[PDB]
Amino acid sequence: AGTSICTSEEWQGLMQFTLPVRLCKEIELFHFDIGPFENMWPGIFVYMVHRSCGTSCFELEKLCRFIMSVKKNYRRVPYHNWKHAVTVAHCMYAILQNNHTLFTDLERKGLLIACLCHDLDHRGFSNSYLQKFDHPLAALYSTSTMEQHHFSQTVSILQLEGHNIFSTLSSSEYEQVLEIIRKAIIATDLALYFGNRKQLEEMYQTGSLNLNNQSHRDRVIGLMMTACDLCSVTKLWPVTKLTANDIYAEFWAEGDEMKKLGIQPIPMMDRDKKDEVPQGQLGFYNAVAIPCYTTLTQILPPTEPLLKACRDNLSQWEKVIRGEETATWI
């Protein structure tokens, strides 16, 4: 109950940070894994904001406060946590860097911030759970339940003393960026993804796709959000496989709760059905990940390495199913 705020020592320490030279080159690539550099994650985000949006886009004090309060409002859950937030923001950075002048200054800043904030205060439960069992959140937010909460948490953090990184925007640009953010966060509801990707595919194939059309732009941004949210499937195989362990740790914990209330969980959230995971992963890649990156690659051809990597990981799950799997740790 309530918005957390970073300490003086936390945000002051971030202002001092400089990115090691070797990482400067690596951070540009789509497959970059932030995993091994935990101490550097806030500093990595500052760096990305500064390279994409400029060293004076935000007042440094307010941005450093904002980042450390966002960090503090992610929960210590196995997957929908601070590491996930920075991972999704890094994917967005790589997409924007490769497609830079397609997007406005306002869009780039709003989207980097939306990615960092997009799962704020996640409790490790799905929309399915909150709705099936009438959590107060599902009463307040009838659809896209958690995503509407993540947006509310973002606005709550911006409204903290010294935390409004957007306050120096004109009143018009301030409304615009908040709407960019709101739309981008709501688009991370995978329910909405299926229709969005279908709409985009048809627009692309008929030639009606037009990025000067605001509604088109919104949908393209929405698909970029999905692509970033799912980007664990675009990393090198060992990273992808380890990330899957974290994702399933959350699912299984939710499944246990459904059992307690007399409901058999979906097999995916059932820790007694781990044998079905490889087939489950295949389904997810075929129905969700491959289509997402295929459509994104059509619209933004520089994002092709995401699709290549996703295809590579699908081939690895197929190997698991055939029993060709080699050694892994946890």
Ligand X SMILES: Cc1cc(N)ccc1O
Binds ligand X by CB under 6 A, chosen from 230, 296, 309, 314: 230
Residue 126 contact among ligand X, Ni ion, none, beta carbon within 5 to 8 Å by kind: none
Nearer to ligand X, 281 or 295 (CB): 281
Nearer to ligand X, 81 or 281 (CB): 281
Q: Indicate whether 284 belongs to the interface with ligand X (CB under 6 A).
A: yes
Residue 270 contact among ligand X, Ni ion, none, beta carbon within 5 to 8 Å by kind: none
Least distance between ligand X and beta carbon 316 (Å): 12
Catalytic residue among 50, 80, 100, 122: 80
DSSP codes, 64-131: HHHHHHHHHTS-S-SSSSHHHHHHHHHHHHHHHHHTGGGS-HHHHHHHHHHHHHTTTT--S--HHHHH
Q: How many other C-beta atoms can be found within 10 angstroms of the C-beta atom of residue 101?
A: 5
Tell me: is residue 118 an annotated ligand-binding position: yes
Q: How many residues bind ligand X (CB under 6 A)?
A: 7
Tell me: is residue 50 an annotated ligand-binding position: no
Q: What is the 3-state secondary structure (H, E, C) of 295-319?
A: HHHHHCHHHHHHHHHHHHHHHHHHH
Nearer to ligand X, 17 or 284 (CB): 284
CA distance 243 to 245: 5
On the CB side of 172, CA atoms within 13 Å amount to 0
Residue 81 contact among ligand X, Ni ion, none, beta carbon within 5 to 8 Å by kind: none
Binds ligand X by CB under 6 A, chosen from 126, 164, 232, 297: 232
Tell me: is residue 229 an annotated ligand-binding position: yes
Residue 164 contact among Ni ion, ligand X, none, beta carbon within 5 to 8 Å by kind: none
* Residue 216 is a catalytic residue: no
Q: At 21, is the secondary structure helix, strand, or coil?
A: helix
Q: Indicate whether 92 belongs to the interface with ligand X (CB under 6 A).
A: no
Which has the closest alpha carbon to 169: 67, 46, 63, 57? Answer: 57
Nearer to ligand X, 244 or 258 (CB): 244
Q: Indicate whether 269 belongs to the interface with ligand X (CB under 6 A).
A: no
Binds ligand X by CB under 6 A, chosen from 27, 223, 233, 307: 233
Distances from the Cα of 78 to the Cαs of 67, 101, 245, in angstroms? 20, 36, 9
Residue 119 contact among ligand X, Ni ion, none, beta carbon within 5 to 8 Å by kind: Ni ion
Residue 284 contact among Ni ion, ligand X, none, beta carbon within 5 to 8 Å by kind: ligand X
Nearer to Ni ion, 33 or 119 (CB): 119
CA distance 290 to 118: 22
Cβ atoms of 227 and 116 closer than 8 Å = no
Tell me: is residue 281 an annotated ligand-binding position: yes
DSSP codes, 216-254: HHHHHHHHHHHHHHTGGGGS-HHHHHHHHHHHHHHHHHH
Nearer to Ni ion, 146 or 203 (CB): 146
Residues near Ni ion, by CB under 5 A: 119, 188, 229
Which has the closest alpha carbon to 114: 182, 161, 57? Answer: 182
Q: Indicate whether 306 belongs to the interface with ligand X (CB under 6 A).
A: no
Find tokens 């229709």 and name the residue. 195
Within residues 36-75, the interface with ligand X by CB under 6 A covers none
Q: Indicate whether 244 belongs to the interface with ligand X (CB under 6 A).
A: yes
CA distance 115 to 111: 6
- The string over 42-74, giving b where at least 16 C-beta atoms fall within 10 Å of a residue's C-beta and e elsewhere, is bbbbbbbbbbbbeeebbebebbbbbbbbbbebb
Per CB under 6 A, residues contacting ligand X are 230, 232-233, 244, 247, 281, 284
Specify binding-site residues for 3',5'-cyclic AMP. Answer: 80, 281
Specify binding-site residues for 3',5'-cyclic GMP. Answer: 80, 281
Which residues are identified as catalytic?
80
